[PDB]
């Protein structure tokens, strides 16, 4: 059959130019007389139509998105790309490259949606801090310990305990936007309090866009 795969960076700065290219495998752009269209979808919102293109220069754009959508087709590389101008923070949507058989009809084949996030900061590494359990951190026969990930850009960040050997009781929370640009989250694991002083717990926080891997040991709090 045929398939549609998108490329381009998943991040874009405000008031910049977006470059997302969708490539085609198993078919031909010019042959068959079909259309191409770009459709975006914000998280938790409905689908929004951006524009449609033919293998020739025919183009039609949404009236709300007019004078900002620039889409071109290069038949030599068997792909088409969309360029967006004046991207704001409200442009955060999942971009879908869907094949369209009938111009007034269905989008029969949909490509997988790339995530586009618009934020205003410089890509910075995370700051990992230990989360020391204590007497106030245990309720009953079990205790809790974790690791804090604060002031990083962008999503996502993965946290693994003991190089993935500890999975039971591990809770990784979704990130939340801080008061100034960056994100923050934590990953914690519930453990019986008997093995607090006899077992070593190390969290492994990885931030691929900033290329930072931080291993932080977790120990019980020492009163000073």
């Amino acid at each position: 059959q045929v398939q549609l795969q998108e490329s381009g960076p998943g991040l874009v700065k405000p008031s910049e130019t977006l470059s997302l290219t969708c490539t085609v495998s198993g078919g031909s752009v010019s042959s068959g007389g079909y259309f191409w269209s770009w459709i975006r979808q914000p998280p938790g919102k409905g689908l929004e139509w951006i524009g449609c293109i033919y293998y020739s220069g025919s183009t039609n754009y949404n009236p709300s998105l007019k004078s900002r959508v620039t889409i071109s087709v290069d038949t030599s590389k068997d792909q088409f790309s969309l360029k967006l101008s004046s991207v704001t923070a409200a442009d955060t949507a999942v971009y879908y490259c869907a094949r369209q058989l009938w111009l007034r009809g269905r989008f029969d084949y949909w490509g997988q949606g790339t995530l586009v996030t618009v934020s205003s900061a410089s890509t910075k590494g995370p700051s990992v801090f230990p989360l020391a359990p204590s007497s106030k951190s245990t309720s009953g026969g079990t205790a809790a310990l974790g690791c804090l990930v604060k002031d990083y850009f962008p999503e996502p960040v993965t946290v693994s305990w003991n190089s993935g050997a500890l999975t039971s009781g591990v809770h990784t929370f979704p990130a939340v936007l801080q008061s100034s640009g960056l994100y923050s989250l934590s990953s914690v694991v519930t453990v019986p309090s008997s093995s607090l002083g006899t077992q070593t717990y190390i969290c492994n926080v990885n931030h691929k866009p900033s290329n930072t891997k931080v291993d932080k040991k977790v120990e019980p709090k020492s009163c000073d």
Partner: protein
């Protein structure tokens, strides 16, 4: 200025029949073809009907669509609701060289019971203090329903500046999980005698406290 109106929330128990509407404002609903798309969360949308009455090869027969052109409303009838039917439904149009989608109708199947909100409090670390930063982290876990209100306290005064909290998220054991973060300066951490995080869940309050030690 043609927009498709869809019911935002639709719920029905499995095995029954539910009708999803799609009303056009200006243009008539029989003017252009209407396409319904069923999209799973975290997945690409898939076409489940086309030509307003024809089912594509692969979808079940139950995805039946009807057109009420007098009321300018497009209808999609679902019979025999199942677990996998829980997805976002969007209706499509074309207008005049400008494809217009629908508002979005979510299929609800129409669940663990109340769960105790275990609470853990963590003081700022010494390594963070050496970095001229401080953070109080409150953890909220193993609870149901997923609606917890947090309120930080500085000994007795409530704290709102620098408070960051997370929306509840479902756990592996059918319960929910949440967190709250209190950004603070190293001087403000030692200025007050103690800091506490109070969790209100279904009226009951679970409180933990921490002190600089």
């Amino acid at each position: 200025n043609f927009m498709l109106t869809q019911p935002h929330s639709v719920s029905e128990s499995p095995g029954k029949t539910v009708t999803i509407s799609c009303t056009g404002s200006s243009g008539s609903i029989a003017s252009n073809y209407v396409q319904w798309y069923q999209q799973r969360p975290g997945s690409a949308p898939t076409t489940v009907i086309y030509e307003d009455n024809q089912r594509p090869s692969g979808v079940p027969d139950r995805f039946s669509g009807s057109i009420d052109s007098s009321s300018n409303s497009a209808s999609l009838t679902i019979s025999g609701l199942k677990t996998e039917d829980e997805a976002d439904y969007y209706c499509q149009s074309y207008d005049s060289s400008n494809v217009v989608f629908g508002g979005g109708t979510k299929l609800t199947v129409l669940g663990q019971p109340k769960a105790a909100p275990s609470v853990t409090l963590f003081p700022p670390s010494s390594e963070e203090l050496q970095a001229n930063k401080a953070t109080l982290v409150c953890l909220i876990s193993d609870f149901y329903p997923g609606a917890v209100t947090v309120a930080w306290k500085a000994d007795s005064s409530p704290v709102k500046a620098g408070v960051e909290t997370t929306t509840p998220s479902k756990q592996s054991n059918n319960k929910y999980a949440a967190s709250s973060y209190l950004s603070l300066t190293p001087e403000q951490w030692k200025s007050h005698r103690s800091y506490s995080c109070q969790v209100t869940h279904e009226g009951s309050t679970v409180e933990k406290t921490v002190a600089p030690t």
